[PDB]
Amino acid sequence: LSRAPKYPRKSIPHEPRLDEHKIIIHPLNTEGALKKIEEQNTLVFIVDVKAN
Amino acid sequence: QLALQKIEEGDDTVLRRKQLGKFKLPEKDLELVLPDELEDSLRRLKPEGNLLKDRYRSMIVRGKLEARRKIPFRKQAKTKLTEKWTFKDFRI
Amino acid sequence: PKNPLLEKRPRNFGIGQDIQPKRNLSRMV
Amino acid sequence: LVPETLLKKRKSQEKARAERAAAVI
Amino acid sequence: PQEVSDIKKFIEICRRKDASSARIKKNPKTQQIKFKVRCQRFLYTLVLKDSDKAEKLKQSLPPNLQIKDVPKRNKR
Amino acid sequence: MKFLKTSRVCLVTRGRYAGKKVVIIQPVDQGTKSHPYGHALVAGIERYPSKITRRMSKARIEKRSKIKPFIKVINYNHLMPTRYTLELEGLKAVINADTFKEPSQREEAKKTVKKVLEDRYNSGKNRWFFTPLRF
Amino acid sequence: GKAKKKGKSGAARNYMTRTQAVKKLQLSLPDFRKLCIWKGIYPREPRDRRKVNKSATASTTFYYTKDIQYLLHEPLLQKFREQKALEKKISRALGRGDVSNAARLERNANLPEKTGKPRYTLNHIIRERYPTFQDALRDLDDCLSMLFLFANLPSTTAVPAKMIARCERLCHEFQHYLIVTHSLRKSFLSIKGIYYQANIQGEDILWLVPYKFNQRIVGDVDFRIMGTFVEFYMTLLGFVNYRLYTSIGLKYPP
């Protein structure tokens, strides 16, 4: 038999721990990013360490 | 030429070649009164076909279930018969 | 009439010849 | 090959199959 | 990279739907011309002798497929 | 005494048909300009008829009783002769040296061989010729 | 990154066989076929059946993995297990000789032979299968044909006499609704039966009624799965009749 509990162990499901506002922190303002913008069509960001 | 070759309600009368189940559904029973067998009254009417088989064929053709055959006998579990210990040790 | 295309292949279960059949081993389970 | 006889034979086998399927201490 | 030795096969390759582009490379020292068509997997090259028929083959190539002549310098 | 004669049954030991059973149609001991060695023109079975049991349907039996034949020029060194002999009247001069030189005659010859071999198999005789060799 | 393995994705995850489905649901084959008929799980066909199962033949039945996982949450599985446990308790009471306890446990079994209704309630199934009364009216053709056919059959273990009488009751109630609202449009005396065409709320409903004779039950049909269809169509027609009688402002049941 599968579990059919008489009470939930956790009353409230927790929110997404890694949502998009925590994923994207801020872009990079260095000359590497600024060169890549014009020469590579590439934007450089500083993001969360846990994000893929 | 290849493009032209690619360019070039259902019926229960003719079915696809591929089966759905244990066998392919046969052609239906003949539902027609022969000219000898016509009658002139509703009282003497000879009903034709079987409505149970008609509904069963309708279900199979529409695909709600697959065509299976009846299993009249199932293979019994192979067992060995022995005498009980009390009946073996009965003494008189 | 039986089809002549049928043939019999008896198996002899002596030592060294064909594989022993599956017998009741309930005495030795 | 009389079509009336062929249809009567077909209906005869059909009805035959239908009836044959429906049938010391 | 694959070399196509059949004009008919090159025509079907150019009429294939994956043909992004084609280019013309003329080598005058060797007196040769190369038709290079770019597809999804392979770049197909047809090698012909420099001739008016070779120049005319561009007309029998599909008009939808873009064709460009290779300049003398591969500018980055 | 000579034993690579007409209707002699042999086993093919080299080539694509290694292990197959053939019947000799025409022995050439002296040799040919194309084949300067002792050889033979043979016909045999490439795909044997399958096993048939008592509870099988007649359509499945008729499907599994088919025989795929082949015709071959074969060296004597690539044949293993058998003591069995398969005398078939339909195989008399069905193939020659000219048969293998143009394609079409090979398929009507194979059709003739298939017909006669299936008739002999349905007769129920010469069961060793139709059971495949297990090696 | 890491190399995928063969047969771990695609049609192998998209389909499963009937054996894998019954092993997943831990059901007996009659219960599985009954639940599939009631919930509308239909047989499927992969493009290559060997990619799903290497032992699959042309007679192998395939279903959707998501369909089986949807069946996994059906409340009727608990009802099946409860009824099996209750039958074991009844057998225990009969074997120990507690006849009063056996009767008291048997009145909780809700048998079709004593109630005239299906053993398991399909009310939650009806709403899931027919989101709209228009869908109910569109399946009423098959529903009415099925019930009008089984109104004239002898009793079996699959469909008992009280159940057949209930089918007759529902057919008569629907006929009374049609008579009162004057919704019957066409009729046809064919060689196989009487065709009736009615018009209920813009939907044309055509069904076939056998002539009143001894109907022959043949061995070429699966009568037990036909009986499961009878239970489903009975449960549907009860709600359809209630909605129609309430719509024309009559007391249901009459």
Added chain:
Amino acid sequence: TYDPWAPDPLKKPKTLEQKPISLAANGKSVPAVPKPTGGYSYNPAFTDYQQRLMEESEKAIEAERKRLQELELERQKMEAAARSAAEAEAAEARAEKP
């Protein structure tokens, strides 16, 4: 009473929304109760009855022709097998530097 139309998956899968397989040759959905034709009436019109009669007649004729052709093929196969067996019995009787 109860009136319809008025983690568990409350959302049904799209696999259930897929339509069932139809065994019809054209691939279209077969109706549950198809509309009958006037030739199926208990007191049918003459033209409809004659049309149905000739269709079933030609079907029976071609079926009988097919089964007679198959019987001829089977008896020819048995005759060929018998002749080959007779020939086998007769053969066994006769055997007994560059």
Added chain:
RNA sequence: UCGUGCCCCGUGUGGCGAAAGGGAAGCCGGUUAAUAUUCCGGCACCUGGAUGUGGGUUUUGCGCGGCAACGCAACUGAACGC
């Protein structure tokens, strides 16, 4: 379908343990103040999946050729074994 069962099989038992052992697959050119077989351009490959087209096989149903070693763009194959 006595509908709530039956059949087959044996070989055991899980995990960790190598940036020098075994191992699916990427090269060239250019580019930064500092990275590059990782960026850019060009040209590829591997693994897995789904499903088309072309071509192949088949009315002698599951290819053809070579004496042979074997060849050819394909050319059915579950359990169980080598």
